[PDB]
Amino acid sequence: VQELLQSEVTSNNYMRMMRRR
Amino acid sequence: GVSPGGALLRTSRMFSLPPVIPPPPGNKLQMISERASATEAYPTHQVLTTFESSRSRGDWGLKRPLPLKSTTGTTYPMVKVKEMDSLEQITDFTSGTQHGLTLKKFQALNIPISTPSEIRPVQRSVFEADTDVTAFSPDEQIQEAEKRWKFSGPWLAGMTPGEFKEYLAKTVRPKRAEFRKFIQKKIAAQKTEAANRELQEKPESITDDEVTEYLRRLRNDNQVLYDLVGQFLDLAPLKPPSPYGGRGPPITHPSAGISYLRTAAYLNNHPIYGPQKSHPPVQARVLKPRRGNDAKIGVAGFVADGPLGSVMDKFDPSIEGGAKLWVNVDKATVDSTGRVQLTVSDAKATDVLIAKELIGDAREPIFGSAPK
Amino acid sequence: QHYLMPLRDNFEQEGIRNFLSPGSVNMAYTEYQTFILEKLNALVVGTDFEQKDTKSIVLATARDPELAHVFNHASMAHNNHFFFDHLSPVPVKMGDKLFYHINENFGSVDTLRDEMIGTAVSMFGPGFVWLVRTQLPGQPVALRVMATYLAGSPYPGAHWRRQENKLEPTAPGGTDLIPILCLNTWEYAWLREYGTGVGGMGGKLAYAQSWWNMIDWAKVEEEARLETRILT
Amino acid sequence: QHYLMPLRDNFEQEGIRNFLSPGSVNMAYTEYQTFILEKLNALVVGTDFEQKDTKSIVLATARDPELAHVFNHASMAHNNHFFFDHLSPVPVKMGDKLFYHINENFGSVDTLRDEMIGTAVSMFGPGFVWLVRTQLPGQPVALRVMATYLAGSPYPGAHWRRQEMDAQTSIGSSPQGLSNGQRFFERSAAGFKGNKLEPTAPGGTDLIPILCLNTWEYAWLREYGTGVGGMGGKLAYAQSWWNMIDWAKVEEEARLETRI
Amino acid sequence: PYPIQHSPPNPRARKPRNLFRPTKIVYPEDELRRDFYRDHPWELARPRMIIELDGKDARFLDWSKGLRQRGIPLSGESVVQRQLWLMENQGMTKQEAYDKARHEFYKLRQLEQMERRIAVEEARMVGGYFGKDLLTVGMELENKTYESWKKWATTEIARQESARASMYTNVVDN
């Protein structure tokens, strides 16, 4: 199931680059 | 008396440029970015155009011809002029396609603007003599005041504490004497309504012995007084005892000029299939997925929350060009802040394929090939 | 053999008071309809469509190049008669039960007037502006304004359908529509009386404007079937 | 602004002798063309088309779906005037060169007549019947008949708005229906994606409209009436129109290659 | 010289300055323009041409007829001039004349938006196909730009994680 979190580990990363609300 | 040269300038096209309107009001007590600024809610400057014969020369009817590098090549010529001549002896301009083409996009949805109503989705247009009115007269009552949209007084709940003190010490306090006269005119009727029937079986409106007799009687019922104070200060109704007074009145006309359609109660007749049930779907973007809570979607340049319902749940770098989903725009209205809020609801499936048929992207055509 | 049906209130001899003249109705219905019918009779004589009524022919001979001529005259003959059928001699008042539903679909009577007329003047082509009732999710009684372009039969049976009663009830993405009112924008009805319309005087605009004052709202209400909250 | 220009041979004052009354041409061209131009001006009053001619607007606003309403008034004004610029007060004798080209493409002069008139009535709708001159890269100059609906344009540059056949009565489930339907979607799909189905020579020199016939009802329903019983009407209008065709001008604009 | 005074100078100043300074040109319409374009902010997105052709556009403007004039497009200016005319000739108030001229503006704008829809739909009923609409063209451009951001984010994300590896001390492996 770690494959799921591994995918989210990158999701939050990309979302951190969306410097806009 | 005006000179002939001054009579032409008054009617000149350049002189018709309206003044830059204030930007969409944001929260005063909040941080903001210093240097970088994105597109605004609604345009503040006028978008300019030229003939394609003159654009090749940089002529835009301005002080000087603009550079050809930054104004030629594109399809739609649009430019915004912040200053016709700055301290650098140049015309500080910028492209106007950000707002110029956003208007064309929205108007391509063919959806009118409705009056916000708290949550039978009865939609009433804005362009109606019942509500769309600005002129009034002293005979206006509070019932009719709920139909107007342009009040000259401010919204109390919206004003900051400091702004509220200035309002009291600059607009409410010096209006004491005039307000007493307002009651005198009202009491002139208080006497004459005793003659409501004297003829079926007004006085000169100056009595200091009366204006004091009335307000002292209203200290036990504060509601009736507030309604009387709002008429004199032109304050938008706040308490229910209706026209969406929760968030405040609109700082602009409800349409805002974006679109002047009144109703979407039409059935676009498809060429082959015939009259359709719903309106043609529109592909929307996916910004800020759920998993900073909530989902956003870019619908024709405007940002509206995702439909009530996946691509939206989490961010997927695998999709090309981002997550794009088809959707139908149900209702659109303008916020008290001046924004355009779209109540977007997910679209059907067959309609998306019906739309792709004309575009040609429909892998499986519905006509002929479809056996069932 | 389809015969020229008589109009409602002797409009052939008198015509509406402030909408059309007796001569205009003569060229609009008495002469034109006869031209369409006779041409339609020569195409359906000694065939299954011999005594079939107008609405049955348009639905049968629908969307096929071999029967394009019969469909054209058939639809135009029906829609034309359907236009003069809802006209009243004097301005009749609108029923309260209908005045209520219009306010829940359009928001005001004025908005409906400026959508139907607006759709007509913004056509640039002779068609029919319909006011059909249907059932949509969220509002059982739903009134909508639909437009037809030179042959449009507002009924759903005159449109392409899929099979699997093989032929499906409605067309892809289609709706079930009961036509209530129509406006005829063909020059035969308005060109003579109201003229070209150059400069704003008269024209197709004034024609559609005067038509709004002579609608038989009584019949416009009974055909709506406001009692059947669920239409199937 | 676009203003009404006079007609060819003083028709607004007298009208053709045996084709159209002086009052009919008054309502057909003077009162109508002015109405269209009035509407056209309001649409291009503050655009780049404010000083462009009709044809330039017909080709510029052909594919853009947001300017479709502008194309109608522009093409309608062009097609209308194009129809009156080919008539004459007295019938003209067809040229020998043109007379020989028609027979090679239609068999006989009248065979083309019954084809154009037949297409006008068969269309059953406001439109224009065009006699186009199509010449492919290696093909000789060949003529053919083309019909256009309410405000269709015959030029290739405006193929987006040719409007050759109706969709209500030509797209069904029959063998011809499916074929016609496929072409309808193929065009819309190719046009949208930008792909062109039929290569066209540069400059739109493929099709050159020579003759036209305005089948709009506002032009004949007054002079020839409705046509009850077959007397007058649209049929007689088309027949009488054939007598006033300026075959001399039809030959000049044809520009047939010397071959005899 | 003493420049032209476009507004009455302050009659209270006892020793005023800037006597040889040109004054600002202010007309009664300036007040109305600001009031209109604030109620209709998106009216500015409508591209308007200020380049003049011959300067004679004012010779055919008779605001007693209505909003639609010769030479000039239907803009917020036509509403202001029509408003000003009624407010002067017919002795109407600023609010009353504003409503009248403003309502005539809507009914004209509505018909223009209805023609686009009915024109396209009508054309397709007779075999008329169009090109790419602005909606589809706008989304395609966003895709090309979004992809470029995906690359930048991917590149930057790599740099940050790599920096963390170097930041942490792995000098000795045991």
PDB file of N, CA and C in Angstrom, chain D residues 173-241:
ATOM      1  N   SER D 173     -31.202   7.769 -42.209  1.00  0.00           N
ATOM      2  CA  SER D 173     -30.641   6.433 -42.074  1.00  0.00           C
ATOM      3  C   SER D 173     -30.572   5.682 -43.396  1.00  0.00           C
ATOM      4  N   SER D 174     -31.187   6.207 -44.453  1.00  0.00           N
ATOM      5  CA  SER D 174     -31.148   5.566 -45.753  1.00  0.00           C
ATOM      6  C   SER D 174     -29.719   5.572 -46.286  1.00  0.00           C
ATOM      7  N   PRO D 175     -29.439   4.785 -47.329  1.00  0.00           N
ATOM      8  CA  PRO D 175     -28.082   4.795 -47.901  1.00  0.00           C
ATOM      9  C   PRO D 175     -27.580   6.184 -48.256  1.00  0.00           C
ATOM     10  N   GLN D 176     -28.425   7.015 -48.871  1.00  0.00           N
ATOM     11  CA  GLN D 176     -28.026   8.389 -49.155  1.00  0.00           C
ATOM     12  C   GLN D 176     -27.938   9.220 -47.883  1.00  0.00           C
ATOM     13  N   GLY D 177     -28.764   8.909 -46.884  1.00  0.00           N
ATOM     14  CA  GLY D 177     -28.711   9.656 -45.638  1.00  0.00           C
ATOM     15  C   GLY D 177     -27.389   9.485 -44.916  1.00  0.00           C
ATOM     16  N   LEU D 178     -26.958   8.235 -44.739  1.00  0.00           N
ATOM     17  CA  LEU D 178     -25.694   7.976 -44.057  1.00  0.00           C
ATOM     18  C   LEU D 178     -24.534   8.646 -44.783  1.00  0.00           C
ATOM     19  N   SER D 179     -24.494   8.518 -46.110  1.00  0.00           N
ATOM     20  CA  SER D 179     -23.435   9.156 -46.885  1.00  0.00           C
ATOM     21  C   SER D 179     -23.422  10.662 -46.656  1.00  0.00           C
ATOM     22  N   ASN D 180     -24.577  11.310 -46.820  1.00  0.00           N
ATOM     23  CA  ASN D 180     -24.656  12.748 -46.589  1.00  0.00           C
ATOM     24  C   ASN D 180     -24.265  13.098 -45.159  1.00  0.00           C
ATOM     25  N   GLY D 181     -24.703  12.292 -44.191  1.00  0.00           N
ATOM     26  CA  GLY D 181     -24.353  12.562 -42.806  1.00  0.00           C
ATOM     27  C   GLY D 181     -22.860  12.477 -42.554  1.00  0.00           C
ATOM     28  N   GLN D 182     -22.205  11.467 -43.129  1.00  0.00           N
ATOM     29  CA  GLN D 182     -20.761  11.329 -42.967  1.00  0.00           C
ATOM     30  C   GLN D 182     -20.033  12.559 -43.493  1.00  0.00           C
ATOM     31  N   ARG D 183     -20.410  13.023 -44.686  1.00  0.00           N
ATOM     32  CA  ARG D 183     -19.788  14.220 -45.244  1.00  0.00           C
ATOM     33  C   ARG D 183     -19.988  15.420 -44.329  1.00  0.00           C
ATOM     34  N   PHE D 184     -21.156  15.514 -43.691  1.00  0.00           N
ATOM     35  CA  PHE D 184     -21.420  16.629 -42.789  1.00  0.00           C
ATOM     36  C   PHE D 184     -20.438  16.636 -41.624  1.00  0.00           C
ATOM     37  N   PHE D 185     -20.234  15.477 -40.995  1.00  0.00           N
ATOM     38  CA  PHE D 185     -19.320  15.406 -39.861  1.00  0.00           C
ATOM     39  C   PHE D 185     -17.868  15.491 -40.313  1.00  0.00           C
ATOM     40  N   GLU D 186     -17.546  14.894 -41.462  1.00  0.00           N
ATOM     41  CA  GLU D 186     -16.182  14.964 -41.974  1.00  0.00           C
ATOM     42  C   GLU D 186     -15.757  16.407 -42.210  1.00  0.00           C
ATOM     43  N   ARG D 187     -16.649  17.219 -42.779  1.00  0.00           N
ATOM     44  CA  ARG D 187     -16.334  18.625 -43.009  1.00  0.00           C
ATOM     45  C   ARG D 187     -16.146  19.367 -41.692  1.00  0.00           C
ATOM     46  N   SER D 188     -17.126  19.265 -40.791  1.00  0.00           N
ATOM     47  CA  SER D 188     -17.019  19.941 -39.503  1.00  0.00           C
ATOM     48  C   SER D 188     -15.766  19.505 -38.755  1.00  0.00           C
ATOM     49  N   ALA D 189     -15.446  18.211 -38.801  1.00  0.00           N
ATOM     50  CA  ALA D 189     -14.249  17.723 -38.124  1.00  0.00           C
ATOM     51  C   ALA D 189     -12.986  18.253 -38.788  1.00  0.00           C
ATOM     52  N   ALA D 190     -12.931  18.218 -40.120  1.00  0.00           N
ATOM     53  CA  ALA D 190     -11.753  18.717 -40.821  1.00  0.00           C
ATOM     54  C   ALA D 190     -11.637  20.228 -40.690  1.00  0.00           C
ATOM     55  N   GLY D 191     -12.749  20.944 -40.859  1.00  0.00           N
ATOM     56  CA  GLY D 191     -12.708  22.391 -40.726  1.00  0.00           C
ATOM     57  C   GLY D 191     -12.231  22.830 -39.356  1.00  0.00           C
ATOM     58  N   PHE D 192     -12.740  22.188 -38.303  1.00  0.00           N
ATOM     59  CA  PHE D 192     -12.315  22.534 -36.952  1.00  0.00           C
ATOM     60  C   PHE D 192     -10.824  22.283 -36.773  1.00  0.00           C
ATOM     61  N   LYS D 193     -10.373  21.066 -37.079  1.00  0.00           N
ATOM     62  CA  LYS D 193      -8.969  20.718 -36.910  1.00  0.00           C
ATOM     63  C   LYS D 193      -8.054  21.479 -37.859  1.00  0.00           C
ATOM     64  N   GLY D 194      -8.603  22.145 -38.873  1.00  0.00           N
ATOM     65  CA  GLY D 194      -7.819  22.913 -39.815  1.00  0.00           C
ATOM     66  C   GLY D 194      -7.451  22.174 -41.083  1.00  0.00           C
ATOM     67  N   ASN D 195      -7.676  20.864 -41.139  1.00  0.00           N
ATOM     68  CA  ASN D 195      -7.356  20.101 -42.336  1.00  0.00           C
ATOM     69  C   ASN D 195      -8.328  20.439 -43.459  1.00  0.00           C
ATOM     70  N   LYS D 196      -7.808  20.491 -44.682  1.00  0.00           N
ATOM     71  CA  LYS D 196      -8.604  20.784 -45.866  1.00  0.00           C
ATOM     72  C   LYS D 196      -8.847  19.499 -46.646  1.00  0.00           C
ATOM     73  N   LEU D 197     -10.108  19.260 -47.012  1.00  0.00           N
ATOM     74  CA  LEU D 197     -10.459  18.021 -47.698  1.00  0.00           C
ATOM     75  C   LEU D 197     -10.111  18.079 -49.181  1.00  0.00           C
ATOM     76  N   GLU D 198     -10.364  19.210 -49.828  1.00  0.00           N
ATOM     77  CA  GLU D 198     -10.120  19.367 -51.262  1.00  0.00           C
ATOM     78  C   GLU D 198      -9.102  20.474 -51.490  1.00  0.00           C
ATOM     79  N   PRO D 199      -7.898  20.172 -51.978  1.00  0.00           N
ATOM     80  CA  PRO D 199      -6.923  21.241 -52.223  1.00  0.00           C
ATOM     81  C   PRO D 199      -7.496  22.318 -53.132  1.00  0.00           C
ATOM     82  N   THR D 200      -7.104  23.561 -52.867  1.00  0.00           N
ATOM     83  CA  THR D 200      -7.570  24.715 -53.621  1.00  0.00           C
ATOM     84  C   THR D 200      -6.369  25.505 -54.117  1.00  0.00           C
ATOM     85  N   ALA D 201      -6.473  26.022 -55.337  1.00  0.00           N
ATOM     86  CA  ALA D 201      -5.379  26.788 -55.906  1.00  0.00           C
ATOM     87  C   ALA D 201      -5.240  28.125 -55.180  1.00  0.00           C
ATOM     88  N   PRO D 202      -4.032  28.684 -55.130  1.00  0.00           N
ATOM     89  CA  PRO D 202      -3.853  29.963 -54.435  1.00  0.00           C
ATOM     90  C   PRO D 202      -4.617  31.079 -55.131  1.00  0.00           C
ATOM     91  N   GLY D 203      -5.228  31.944 -54.328  1.00  0.00           N
ATOM     92  CA  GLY D 203      -6.007  33.046 -54.847  1.00  0.00           C
ATOM     93  C   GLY D 203      -7.470  32.746 -55.069  1.00  0.00           C
ATOM     94  N   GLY D 204      -7.940  31.564 -54.685  1.00  0.00           N
ATOM     95  CA  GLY D 204      -9.338  31.220 -54.884  1.00  0.00           C
ATOM     96  C   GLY D 204      -9.786  31.334 -56.324  1.00  0.00           C
ATOM     97  N   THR D 205      -8.929  30.946 -57.264  1.00  0.00           N
ATOM     98  CA  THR D 205      -9.247  31.016 -58.683  1.00  0.00           C
ATOM     99  C   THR D 205      -9.980  29.780 -59.185  1.00  0.00           C
ATOM    100  N   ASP D 206     -10.330  28.848 -58.298  1.00  0.00           N
ATOM    101  CA  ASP D 206     -11.032  27.644 -58.726  1.00  0.00           C
ATOM    102  C   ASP D 206     -12.420  27.986 -59.250  1.00  0.00           C
ATOM    103  N   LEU D 207     -13.264  28.554 -58.393  1.00  0.00           N
ATOM    104  CA  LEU D 207     -14.641  28.878 -58.734  1.00  0.00           C
ATOM    105  C   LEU D 207     -14.767  30.372 -58.992  1.00  0.00           C
ATOM    106  N   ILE D 208     -15.391  30.724 -60.111  1.00  0.00           N
ATOM    107  CA  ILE D 208     -15.633  32.121 -60.462  1.00  0.00           C
ATOM    108  C   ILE D 208     -17.119  32.281 -60.759  1.00  0.00           C
ATOM    109  N   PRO D 209     -17.925  32.742 -59.804  1.00  0.00           N
ATOM    110  CA  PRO D 209     -19.365  32.887 -60.062  1.00  0.00           C
ATOM    111  C   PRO D 209     -19.625  33.827 -61.227  1.00  0.00           C
ATOM    112  N   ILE D 210     -20.313  33.311 -62.242  1.00  0.00           N
ATOM    113  CA  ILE D 210     -20.637  34.095 -63.427  1.00  0.00           C
ATOM    114  C   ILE D 210     -22.040  34.664 -63.279  1.00  0.00           C
ATOM    115  N   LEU D 211     -23.026  33.782 -63.147  1.00  0.00           N
ATOM    116  CA  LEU D 211     -24.427  34.161 -63.078  1.00  0.00           C
ATOM    117  C   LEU D 211     -25.020  33.745 -61.739  1.00  0.00           C
ATOM    118  N   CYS D 212     -26.079  34.448 -61.343  1.00  0.00           N
ATOM    119  CA  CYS D 212     -26.753  34.198 -60.079  1.00  0.00           C
ATOM    120  C   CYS D 212     -28.252  34.387 -60.258  1.00  0.00           C
ATOM    121  N   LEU D 213     -29.014  33.803 -59.335  1.00  0.00           N
ATOM    122  CA  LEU D 213     -30.471  33.901 -59.339  1.00  0.00           C
ATOM    123  C   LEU D 213     -30.943  34.001 -57.897  1.00  0.00           C
ATOM    124  N   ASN D 214     -31.452  35.169 -57.516  1.00  0.00           N
ATOM    125  CA  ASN D 214     -31.911  35.407 -56.150  1.00  0.00           C
ATOM    126  C   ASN D 214     -33.304  34.812 -55.998  1.00  0.00           C
ATOM    127  N   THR D 215     -33.383  33.642 -55.371  1.00  0.00           N
ATOM    128  CA  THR D 215     -34.647  32.949 -55.167  1.00  0.00           C
ATOM    129  C   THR D 215     -35.346  33.375 -53.885  1.00  0.00           C
ATOM    130  N   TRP D 216     -34.838  34.400 -53.207  1.00  0.00           N
ATOM    131  CA  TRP D 216     -35.469  34.865 -51.982  1.00  0.00           C
ATOM    132  C   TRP D 216     -36.901  35.297 -52.263  1.00  0.00           C
ATOM    133  N   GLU D 217     -37.787  35.019 -51.307  1.00  0.00           N
ATOM    134  CA  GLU D 217     -39.210  35.247 -51.526  1.00  0.00           C
ATOM    135  C   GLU D 217     -39.551  36.730 -51.583  1.00  0.00           C
ATOM    136  N   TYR D 218     -38.779  37.580 -50.904  1.00  0.00           N
ATOM    137  CA  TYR D 218     -39.084  39.005 -50.899  1.00  0.00           C
ATOM    138  C   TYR D 218     -38.910  39.657 -52.264  1.00  0.00           C
ATOM    139  N   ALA D 219     -38.330  38.957 -53.238  1.00  0.00           N
ATOM    140  CA  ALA D 219     -38.076  39.538 -54.548  1.00  0.00           C
ATOM    141  C   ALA D 219     -39.166  39.239 -55.567  1.00  0.00           C
ATOM    142  N   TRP D 220     -39.927  38.159 -55.387  1.00  0.00           N
ATOM    143  CA  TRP D 220     -40.911  37.739 -56.377  1.00  0.00           C
ATOM    144  C   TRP D 220     -42.324  37.559 -55.843  1.00  0.00           C
ATOM    145  N   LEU D 221     -42.520  37.389 -54.534  1.00  0.00           N
ATOM    146  CA  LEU D 221     -43.864  37.132 -54.029  1.00  0.00           C
ATOM    147  C   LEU D 221     -44.799  38.319 -54.203  1.00  0.00           C
ATOM    148  N   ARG D 222     -44.287  39.482 -54.601  1.00  0.00           N
ATOM    149  CA  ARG D 222     -45.121  40.645 -54.879  1.00  0.00           C
ATOM    150  C   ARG D 222     -45.446  40.780 -56.360  1.00  0.00           C
ATOM    151  N   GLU D 223     -44.440  40.645 -57.226  1.00  0.00           N
ATOM    152  CA  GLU D 223     -44.674  40.785 -58.658  1.00  0.00           C
ATOM    153  C   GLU D 223     -45.402  39.572 -59.221  1.00  0.00           C
ATOM    154  N   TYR D 224     -45.000  38.371 -58.806  1.00  0.00           N
ATOM    155  CA  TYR D 224     -45.564  37.130 -59.319  1.00  0.00           C
ATOM    156  C   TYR D 224     -46.487  36.448 -58.319  1.00  0.00           C
ATOM    157  N   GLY D 225     -46.757  37.082 -57.183  1.00  0.00           N
ATOM    158  CA  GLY D 225     -47.645  36.494 -56.206  1.00  0.00           C
ATOM    159  C   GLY D 225     -47.156  35.139 -55.710  1.00  0.00           C
ATOM    160  N   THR D 226     -48.071  34.452 -55.025  1.00  0.00           N
ATOM    161  CA  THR D 226     -47.751  33.145 -54.460  1.00  0.00           C
ATOM    162  C   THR D 226     -47.602  32.095 -55.555  1.00  0.00           C
ATOM    163  N   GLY D 227     -48.530  32.077 -56.508  1.00  0.00           N
ATOM    164  CA  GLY D 227     -48.477  31.135 -57.607  1.00  0.00           C
ATOM    165  C   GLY D 227     -49.535  30.056 -57.507  1.00  0.00           C
ATOM    166  N   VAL D 228     -50.713  30.422 -57.001  1.00  0.00           N
ATOM    167  CA  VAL D 228     -51.805  29.463 -56.892  1.00  0.00           C
ATOM    168  C   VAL D 228     -52.211  29.000 -58.282  1.00  0.00           C
ATOM    169  N   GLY D 229     -52.379  27.690 -58.438  1.00  0.00           N
ATOM    170  CA  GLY D 229     -52.771  27.123 -59.711  1.00  0.00           C
ATOM    171  C   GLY D 229     -51.679  27.071 -60.754  1.00  0.00           C
ATOM    172  N   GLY D 230     -50.448  27.440 -60.404  1.00  0.00           N
ATOM    173  CA  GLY D 230     -49.338  27.397 -61.329  1.00  0.00           C
ATOM    174  C   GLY D 230     -49.126  28.657 -62.141  1.00  0.00           C
ATOM    175  N   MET D 231     -50.039  29.622 -62.069  1.00  0.00           N
ATOM    176  CA  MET D 231     -49.887  30.888 -62.776  1.00  0.00           C
ATOM    177  C   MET D 231     -49.090  31.857 -61.910  1.00  0.00           C
ATOM    178  N   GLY D 232     -47.931  32.277 -62.409  1.00  0.00           N
ATOM    179  CA  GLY D 232     -47.065  33.168 -61.662  1.00  0.00           C
ATOM    180  C   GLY D 232     -46.233  32.451 -60.621  1.00  0.00           C
ATOM    181  N   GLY D 233     -46.057  33.082 -59.464  1.00  0.00           N
ATOM    182  CA  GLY D 233     -45.326  32.449 -58.389  1.00  0.00           C
ATOM    183  C   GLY D 233     -43.828  32.392 -58.644  1.00  0.00           C
ATOM    184  N   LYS D 234     -43.181  31.491 -57.905  1.00  0.00           N
ATOM    185  CA  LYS D 234     -41.733  31.342 -58.003  1.00  0.00           C
ATOM    186  C   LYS D 234     -41.325  30.758 -59.349  1.00  0.00           C
ATOM    187  N   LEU D 235     -42.125  29.837 -59.888  1.00  0.00           N
ATOM    188  CA  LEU D 235     -41.784  29.204 -61.157  1.00  0.00           C
ATOM    189  C   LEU D 235     -41.696  30.233 -62.277  1.00  0.00           C
ATOM    190  N   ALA D 236     -42.766  31.009 -62.472  1.00  0.00           N
ATOM    191  CA  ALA D 236     -42.766  32.012 -63.532  1.00  0.00           C
ATOM    192  C   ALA D 236     -41.657  33.035 -63.336  1.00  0.00           C
ATOM    193  N   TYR D 237     -41.340  33.369 -62.085  1.00  0.00           N
ATOM    194  CA  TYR D 237     -40.263  34.316 -61.819  1.00  0.00           C
ATOM    195  C   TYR D 237     -38.942  33.809 -62.382  1.00  0.00           C
ATOM    196  N   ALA D 238     -38.627  32.537 -62.133  1.00  0.00           N
ATOM    197  CA  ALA D 238     -37.386  31.967 -62.647  1.00  0.00           C
ATOM    198  C   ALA D 238     -37.390  31.912 -64.169  1.00  0.00           C
ATOM    199  N   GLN D 239     -38.522  31.538 -64.767  1.00  0.00           N
ATOM    200  CA  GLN D 239     -38.603  31.471 -66.223  1.00  0.00           C
ATOM    201  C   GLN D 239     -38.367  32.840 -66.847  1.00  0.00           C
ATOM    202  N   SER D 240     -39.116  33.850 -66.400  1.00  0.00           N
ATOM    203  CA  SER D 240     -38.938  35.192 -66.945  1.00  0.00           C
ATOM    204  C   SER D 240     -37.521  35.699 -66.725  1.00  0.00           C
ATOM    205  N   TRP D 241     -36.899  35.329 -65.603  1.00  0.00           N
ATOM    206  CA  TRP D 241     -35.537  35.774 -65.333  1.00  0.00           C
ATOM    207  C   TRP D 241     -34.573  35.316 -66.417  1.00  0.00           C
TER     208      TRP D 241
END
